Write a protein that binds this ligand. Sequence first.
Ligand SMILES: C[N+](C)(C)[C@@H](Cc1c[nH]c([S@@](=O)C[C@H](NC(=O)CC[C@H]([NH3+])C(=O)O)C(=O)O)n1)C(=O)O
Ligand SMILES: C[N+](C)(C)[C@@H](Cc1c[nH]c([S@@](=O)C[C@H](NC(=O)CC[C@H]([NH3+])C(=O)O)C(=O)O)n1)C(=O)O
Ligand SMILES: C[N+](C)(C)[C@@H](Cc1c[nH]c([S@@](=O)C[C@H](NC(=O)CC[C@H]([NH3+])C(=O)O)C(=O)O)n1)C(=O)O
Ligand SMILES: C[N+](C)(C)[C@@H](Cc1c[nH]c([S@@](=O)C[C@H](NC(=O)CC[C@H]([NH3+])C(=O)O)C(=O)O)n1)C(=O)O
Lengths: 229, 228, 229, 227
Amino acid sequence: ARHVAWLGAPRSLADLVLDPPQGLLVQSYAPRRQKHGLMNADGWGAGFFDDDGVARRWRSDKPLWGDASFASVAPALRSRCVVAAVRSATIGMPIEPSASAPFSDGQWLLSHNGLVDRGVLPLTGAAESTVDSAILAALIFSRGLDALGATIAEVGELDPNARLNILAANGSRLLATTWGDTLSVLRRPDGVVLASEPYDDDPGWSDIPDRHLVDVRDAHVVVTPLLEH
Amino acid sequence: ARHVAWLGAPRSLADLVLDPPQGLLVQSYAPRRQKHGLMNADGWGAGFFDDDGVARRWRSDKPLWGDASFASVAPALRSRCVVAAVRSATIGMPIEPSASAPFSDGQWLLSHNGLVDRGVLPLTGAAESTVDSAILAALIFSRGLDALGATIAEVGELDPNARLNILAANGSRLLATTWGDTLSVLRRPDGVVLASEPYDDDPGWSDIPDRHLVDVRDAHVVVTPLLE
Amino acid sequence: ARHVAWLGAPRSLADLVLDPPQGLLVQSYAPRRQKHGLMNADGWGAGFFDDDGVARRWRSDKPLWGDASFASVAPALRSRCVVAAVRSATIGMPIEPSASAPFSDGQWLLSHNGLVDRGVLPLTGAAESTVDSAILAALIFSRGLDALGATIAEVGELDPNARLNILAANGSRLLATTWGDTLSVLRRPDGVVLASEPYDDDPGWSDIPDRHLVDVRDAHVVVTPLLEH
Amino acid sequence: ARHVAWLGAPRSLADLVLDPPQGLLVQSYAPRRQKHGLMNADGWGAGFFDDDGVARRWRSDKPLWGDASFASVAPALRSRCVVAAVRSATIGMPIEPSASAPFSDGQWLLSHNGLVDRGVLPLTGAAESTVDSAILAALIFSRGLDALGATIAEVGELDPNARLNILAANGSRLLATTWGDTLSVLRRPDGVVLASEPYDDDPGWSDIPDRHLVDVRDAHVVVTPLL
Ligand SMILES: C[N+](C)(C)[C@@H](Cc1c[nH]c([S@@](=O)C[C@H](NC(=O)CC[C@H]([NH3+])C(=O)O)C(=O)O)n1)C(=O)O
Ligand SMILES: C[N+](C)(C)[C@@H](Cc1c[nH]c([S@@](=O)C[C@H](NC(=O)CC[C@H]([NH3+])C(=O)O)C(=O)O)n1)C(=O)O
Ligand SMILES: C[N+](C)(C)[C@@H](Cc1c[nH]c([S@@](=O)C[C@H](NC(=O)CC[C@H]([NH3+])C(=O)O)C(=O)O)n1)C(=O)O
Ligand SMILES: C[N+](C)(C)[C@@H](Cc1c[nH]c([S@@](=O)C[C@H](NC(=O)CC[C@H]([NH3+])C(=O)O)C(=O)O)n1)C(=O)O
């Protein structure tokens, strides 16, 4: 999987996801910094907050590059806060829009890049899908996003093989973790991007070190360490 | 099929298509004035013009009522000019979003409710799909929407069993034909609705007689007969 | 929802599902004895057991009537034991093949016609989907099909508003419950059909009364009541 | 696109398409001999002839690798004659099962790997989709498969940039053309495979030269240049 998020002045979904020369559209078939999986063709999702702060989501189980509707409509959807993703799944896992990030609890949008043993996670009746990312999202939402660092550090200890890159947003804040996969940040005059990988060659891109939490709010960017055992 | 169009002040796709008590969402499974087909569950589409006049379209091969993405996003999509439809197809016909109205030539959005023998229509290399409505749309676009009434009269004489209800828009105009199926008009304070059937029980709804052309601009509604 | 099952000498999926004049194909848009939902256009599924006893499944999130692939291929798929369904879901529920019956635990195929409050069911890590029927299937599989009648009575007391029509098969047995919806049986010389409603007007169809269990094995059809509350 | 065909003793769709270590399933995300397109994730199809000679088809607009239904059912579908394909399309082209090979006229199954300018082909009302492969399939069916070589030779001159790899079958015959893309043949004891590329490293695989017709029946493989 690859994901991208925006917090700042209104930006179109197309401008963030489709239009950049190495953005999510390109990453669906030719990602640059992806160690696990060749591509991200098992679905996609784009979530945003409208003027009234309502979380809205377009999700699909198809390759992003072939979605003519999104290509047509995305330029007309603008938001101060966006989380989008393209999905990669091991052969045999369920293909369904409910399994594509971003997940939502109504307040937060959330994407997971990685893998986790569902056996170490609590059972839940609140997940959007059966896929590991949805079970993990349910746990994260249950604990609260203010506790994201704790949740990820804990799950990372329960499953030493897990990769736990989270990217989340609530309309006025971004949260992310690096735990076994990539993330970069771009600070623009008008807002902040977090992305699995840079969507162009802007010299402003900087890479987030592994095992960190990123917290973006009030024009501040915090990159702070997570607990390791 | 059932379709609906809006021309007026900015209106959300949800407000036009999903929210009314008997609007297109409800018509996908329980239409009230549909003589042909039980439902409209073979796909859907919603086209609109953005602030720069660009025609944009969301189309699907699935039942409208089940599309969680559209239900979530439609309230955030607002436009002065919308054409939307829900598709019904006889069993065996191809199911694919390219076959769902509205069709487009970049300037005009167009929906067809009815049936026409592709055998009487010209062959084309410009259709979006193989289905009869797409072949008919290609013809209509080729003749130009200013000739819509004449084109429909022509096709109607070529295929006396054809039903040829067209609903089209270019961002500042609506055009529609009645030819064998239903159409109604609602004049609101802020714009005009044209629809296969009323989306509620507003007393302002009036029915368009069969074999007529409807022309809407700047909330002016002109209804004229088609050629005999 | 409507479902149908077969146990006997081999019959093709088309023969059971598509070809009868009032079979599952027709029921996807024009059911005859369906009190809840106008139609069954939210997906479909056909499960069968092959010659080696392996459970195989074709599932979809599309209306059965439009599925050109199934219409083409179904006549070539023959089995001694079949469970098939067409899905109907209330607006807003997840549309995905994993949510379409039949569900499977590898030994049993299972379809549910009705609805149940997921809040009264146990949490599980074994569900195929988040839909209520999948959570219910997980419970049924966990309790064992030999306890089906008792499990359904129990759930029926936990949720007095639930409808709990189950149809299940393991290659050599059918099991079914009536709990708020319809079921009929047809005894042919070559096997037994159980179905939500008759797929034709054969006078041989018999209706199963509500709140009963049906057990088909060794060419015997045994119908028994369920527990009192 | 990549395609594969079988003519011989009954073989399951899974055995031909899913199970080989470098078969169509793998080619959907990691083809080995494909110059055009990185993958074949824009749909798939598997056509076969049943015991009574009826042509049947399963087609999809999704990536082959993710189709749980096909993975489950394919081992139970056996046939003496199969044509299957995975589709690749440039970004923006219609995604729809009607556009996925194999196409059919009821007698013949047909797959096209390549590209052709629809502008040089006759208009048609008989195509299954609007995509160039479907327009070409319509022309080929119209002319008749007994004329496949002549039709492909003609279209290849009408459009000197066209790539026109056809793989077709009627239950008792395979026909194929090489015209700008790859094709290999494997002769097994129980039948013949034709494929865009070898599905394993069997030493029996041999490559068909470009601009040739391949005609398979009665376990004879006749390879001739196109006239
Ligand atoms: C289907 N295929 C195209 C072959 C995929 C197969 C694949 C293998 N590994 C991957 S990874 O990108 C996904 C992997 N995690 C998972 O598969 C678990 C499911 C994932 N959380 C999900 O959202 O489905 C990871 O991020 O480590 N994809 C590809 O190569 O992209
Ligand atoms: C698939 N099914 C649910 C059984 C349908 C079958 C059906 C029969 N007739 C209809 S009508 O709404 C469509 C009919 N026209 C066509 O089928 C030609 C194709 C149509 N123009 C289209 O856009 O696909 C018409 O408008 O007179 N649907 C239904 O009952 O709605
Ligand atoms: C979407 N729509 C076409 C409007 C449907 C809406 C509807 C209302 N009630 C029904 S019923 O067939 C389903 C209802 N149960 C549910 O919706 C729970 C989910 C169901 N178990 C499932 O498999 O999704 C029941 O069986 O009592 N469908 C229809 O009328 O068929
Ligand atoms: C969508 N994407 C994943 C980026 C594709 C883009 C792509 C570029 N070129 C190709 S090729 O495999 C298809 C190309 N022909 C066409 O695109 C015409 C349409 C094709 N006949 C079809 O059946 O759709 C060819 O065979 O030379 N795919 C990929 O890289 O596989």
